[PDB]
Design a protein around this ligand. Sequence first.
Ligand SMILES: [Ca+2]
Ligand SMILES: [Ca+2]
Ligand SMILES: [Ca+2]
Ligand SMILES: [Ca+2]
Lengths: 89, 89
Amino acid sequence: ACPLDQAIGLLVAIFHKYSGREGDKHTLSKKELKELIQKELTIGSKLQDAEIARLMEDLDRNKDQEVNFQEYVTFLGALALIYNEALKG
Amino acid sequence: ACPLDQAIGLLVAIFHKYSGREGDKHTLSKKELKELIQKELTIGSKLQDAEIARLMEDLDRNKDQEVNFQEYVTFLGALALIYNEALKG
Ligand SMILES: [Ca+2]
Ligand SMILES: [Ca+2]
Ligand SMILES: [Ca+2]
Ligand SMILES: [Ca+2]
């Protein structure tokens, strides 16, 4: 695969690495998502618990306490905007 | 950098690489979009110009004939959904 497809593939793999641990196999519970963030996000392990909780809360748009793939994509987009904004100085 | 950041970072770097060719250094013209697709997407080199034109029409939400980073993020999300399905079961 080309660079772009590879990166997207890696992001999709990360989701499933954590979504299948408990409950529904295709959605992330509060526990799975927190673990994903602390282990896969560079600054994840240093964020306040309250902030991680707020982050997960906002990503759960339909309030079923799960973050499905579409809600995860929203998170990826937020991360991308953050990096892009920093580079534009 | 951790997995999430590495992948997101690369996707951001790819946008910046092709957006600075001509015109607005922060948006992709049709020609920049085409080069980006052809060189960074696995199926890019096989896509026809009519298909790139359709992609532009789809992604260009504000009608300026250019793909800004936000519209590019939407494209990335579409690709992620596609990849996610092949990984489901
Ligand atoms: Ca789960
Ligand atoms: Ca949800
Ligand atoms: Ca440009
Ligand atoms: Ca546009």
